[PDB]
Amino acid sequence: MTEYKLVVVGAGGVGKSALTIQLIQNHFVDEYDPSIEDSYRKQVVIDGETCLLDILDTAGMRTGEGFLCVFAINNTKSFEDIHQYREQIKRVKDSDDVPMVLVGNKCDLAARTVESRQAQDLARSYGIPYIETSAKTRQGVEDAFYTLVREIRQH
Numbered sequence: 001m002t003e004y005k006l007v008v009v010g011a012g013g014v015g016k017s018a019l020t021i022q023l024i025q026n027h028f029v030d031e032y033d034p035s036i037e038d039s040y041r042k043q044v045v046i047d048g049e050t051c052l053l054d055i056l057d058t059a060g061m062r063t064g065e066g067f068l069c070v071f072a073i074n075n076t077k078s079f080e081d082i083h084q085y086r087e088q089i090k091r092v093k094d095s096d097d098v099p100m101v102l103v104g105n106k107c108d109l110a111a112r113t114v115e116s117r118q119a120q121d122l123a124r125s126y127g128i129p130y131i132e133t134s135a136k137t138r139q140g141v142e143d144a145f146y147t148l149v150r151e152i153r154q155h
């Protein structure tokens with residue numbers, strides 16, 4: 001069993017917890033008590049390898065091996081805020097080459113205010129993948145977490 005330490009960061013209310021809980025429980029919740037657990041384990045076979053993911057669901061890092069940087073596609077400020085999370089991750093790691101995936105969440109909602117192209121442009125400037133997700137429908141959720149594992153592996 002190979003361990004991967006993943007850290008989920010991003011602005012308040014973007015769905016960091018919902019995403020994590022979807023991965024762990026295959027369930028979507030409309031609300032998450034302020035006091036929910038922030039550390040999770042998940043045993044999963046990824047590309048034939050048995051992994052034990054260690055997931056820290058932060059509030060809206062030296063230890064983390066890879067970062068899921070999350071915004072919501074109906075929250076322009078949360079997207080703008082990504083720059084701060086990226087700057088913070090680069091400082092902690094003293095590197096601009098850190099395993100990271102940019103995640104645009106809440107993709108099930110109508111009338112998005114952040115376009116796919118905008119986020120793709122941001123991810124490209126950082127040299128990282130962009131993946132859209134919905135914690136509600138589960139769209140992209142496995143893709144996001146498991147790509148972050150695949151990114152750590154190229155590292």
Ligand SMILES: Nc1nc2c(ncn2[C@@H]2O[C@H](COP(=O)(O)OP(=O)(O)NP(=O)(O)O)[C@@H](O)[C@H]2O)c(=O)[nH]1
Nearest residue numbers: 012013014015016017018029030060106134135136
């Ligand atoms: N429609 C929809 N709602 C979502 C999605 N993800 C999260 N939500 C909702 O958005 C709200 C915030 O979700 P939550 O997971 O608590 O966000 P958070 O990023 O963990 N917040 P915090 O930083 O304060 O811990 C909740 O009402 C939750 O149900 C999604 O993909 N789609």
Ligand SMILES: [Mg+2]
Nearest residue numbers: 016017032058
């Ligand atoms: Mg949360």
